[PDB]
Amino acid sequence: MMNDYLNFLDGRVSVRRFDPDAVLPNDLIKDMLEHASYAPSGNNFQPWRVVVVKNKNKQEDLKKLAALQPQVATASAVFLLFGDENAYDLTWWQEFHVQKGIITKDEAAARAERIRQYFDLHPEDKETQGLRLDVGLFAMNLMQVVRVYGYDSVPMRGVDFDAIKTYLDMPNGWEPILMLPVGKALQAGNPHVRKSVAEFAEIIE
Amino acid sequence: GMMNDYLNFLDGRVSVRRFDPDAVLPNDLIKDMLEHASYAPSGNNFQPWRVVVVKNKNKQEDLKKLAALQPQVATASAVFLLFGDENAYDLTWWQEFHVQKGIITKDEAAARAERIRQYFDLHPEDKETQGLRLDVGLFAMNLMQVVRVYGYDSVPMRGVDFDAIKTYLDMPNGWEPILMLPVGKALQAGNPHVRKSVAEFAEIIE
Numbered sequence: 001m002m003n004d005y006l007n008f009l010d011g012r013v014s015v016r017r018f019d020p021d022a023v024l025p026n027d028l029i030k031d032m033l034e035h036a037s038y039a040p041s042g043n044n045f046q047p048w049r050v051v052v053v054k055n056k057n058k059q060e061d062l063k064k065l066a067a068l069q070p071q072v073a074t075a076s077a078v079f080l081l082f083g084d085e086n087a088y089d090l091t092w093w094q095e096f097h098v099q100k101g102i103i104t105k106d107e108a109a110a111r112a113e114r115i116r117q118y119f120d121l122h123p124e125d126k127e128t129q130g131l132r133l134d135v136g137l138f139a140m141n142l143m144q145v146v147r148v149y150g151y152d153s154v155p156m157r158g159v160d161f162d163a164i165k166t167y168l169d170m171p172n173g174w175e176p177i178l179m180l181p182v183g184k185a186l187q188a189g190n191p192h193v194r195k196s197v198a199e200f201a202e203i204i205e
Numbered sequence: 206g207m208m209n210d211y212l213n214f215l216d217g218r219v220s221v222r223r224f225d226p227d228a229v230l231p232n233d234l235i236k237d238m239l240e241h242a243s244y245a246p247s248g249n250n251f252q253p254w255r256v257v258v259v260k261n262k263n264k265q266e267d268l269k270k271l272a273a274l275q276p277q278v279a280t281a282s283a284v285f286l287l288f289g290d291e292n293a294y295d296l297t298w299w300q301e302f303h304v305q306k307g308i309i310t311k312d313e314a315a316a317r318a319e320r321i322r323q324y325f326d327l328h329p330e331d332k333e334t335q336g337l338r339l340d341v342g343l344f345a346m347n348l349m350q351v352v353r354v355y356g357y358d359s360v361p362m363r364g365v366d367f368d369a370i371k372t373y374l375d376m377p378n379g380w381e382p383i384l385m386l387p388v389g390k391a392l393q394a395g396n397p398h399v400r401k402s403v404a405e406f407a408e409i410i411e
């Protein structure tokens with residue numbers, strides 16, 4: 001069963017050939033997003049914002065902004081993952097965590113000052129560098145979750161995100177992180193080729 | 206059935222901060238964990254992650270002092286330090302690696318390399334910390350799921366002094382610290398995930 005889970009995880013590869021007639025229903029999209037959201041993030045700020053485009057005409061427009069990569073138009077839905085800098089809001093953080101019964105109002109106020117002091121020293125963790133890590137965690141989770149339902153994906157950045165935001169009238173404070181076309185594979189992805197563990201990792205005892 | 210089990214497994218990834226200080230994580234498994242985590246995607250398959258795994262309680266106690274005395278650093282079976290190396294975005298390597306592995310032709314490599322250069326020219330951040338954070342973040346999440354397969358748990362961390370840690374371990378300067386990940390056998394279960402609802406962060410347009 002652990003072997004089944006390992007084989008499942010190993011099965012994620014980029015798929016770029018999707019069935020243009022396959023449908024990804026909104027009920028499953030919502031479930032996929034809910035499960036993806038269980039990804040960790042610094043202080044549980046959950047800075048991800050997602051816009052799912054499920055309309056072929058519009059995906060064709062997006063393909064024109066994505067170096068004409070075909071998967072953008074054949075996919076059942078194109079998930080656009082953004083990070084919101086304004087997500088690192090300490091008033092929201094206190095309210096949310098107290099309302100959910102995780103911590104008291106006093107504990108939340110004290111923790112919030114420590115988080116402020118941290119960001120004061122490490123401003124990048126509440127800017128694009130922070131967002132890229134937090135939304136990257138989310139994205140990897142989403143890529144495994146969509147597969148539970150029989151779908152596949154390909155993560156993408158070789159696209160004109162400035163033009164995409166303008167096309168979709170996106171807030172200027174939302175930083176584009178990744179475009180993720182999701183669909184039914186017509187062709188399996190290729191086997192993983194990677195550098196060995198000995199080439200990138202050191203174990204010290 | 207199958208789908209329920211896979212979802213339950215993914216959902217089971219949770220932050221664990223109470224580990225069994227006597228539990229041993231064998232090195233064969235550490236290597237297996239890193240091999241499977243490596244299957245994570247990265248832009249152009251540059252795989253810019255570098256990892257140092259500290260499995261030595263004496264050293265972990267020193268690391269705990271540099272991690273605001275968070276106890277999980279010292280009780281864990283091993284502490285996985287994940288870095289990104291910006292030197293990894295090297296077009297010579299990229300060609301050599303993909304041609305030697307039979308993924309693409311030599312001439313196709315030179316052509317692809319130039320398109321990769323063009324892309325980085327437009328978006329230089331993607332070969333710098335912004336790119337590393339994303340690429341190593343993908344690896345990190347994959348690692349966190351993989352450790353669960355073997356009955357272990359983890360907690361991702363940045364509330365530590367990465368500057369002092371790099372110095373304590375004699376790490377290269379070109380390596381950007383991304384995340385500290387203690388891994389061990391849970392003595393206490395993680396909490397159910399508390400999250401904003403899908404409608405609070407996502408829109409579906411048809």
Ligand SMILES: Cc1cc2nc3c(=O)[nH]c(=O)nc-3n(C[C@H](O)[C@H](O)[C@H](O)COP(=O)(O)O)c2cc1C
Pocket residue numbers: 012013014015016069154155156157158159178189190192244245246247248249250339340343
């Ligand atoms: C940040 C990022 C950007 C990527 N950009 C694209 C892209 O624009 N087009 C594409 O076809 N693949 C893109 N990829 C997919 C990678 O090429 C792919 O993950 C890598 O070659 C490893 O293959 P695998 O995903 O099949 O394991 C991107 C991946 C990441 C993580």
Ligand SMILES: Cc1cc2nc3c(=O)[nH]c(=O)nc-3n(C[C@H](O)[C@H](O)[C@H](O)COP(=O)(O)O)c2cc1C
Pocket residue numbers: 038039040041042043044133134137218219220221222275360361362363364365384395396398399
């Ligand atoms: C970048 C990052 C940094 C984090 N820093 C810490 C940390 O220093 N200490 C800690 O106990 N947890 C840390 N966390 C864990 C988060 O608090 C945790 O993921 C979040 O509260 C959600 O809980 P969950 O992982 O159990 O779902 C960090 C997580 C991320 C992604």
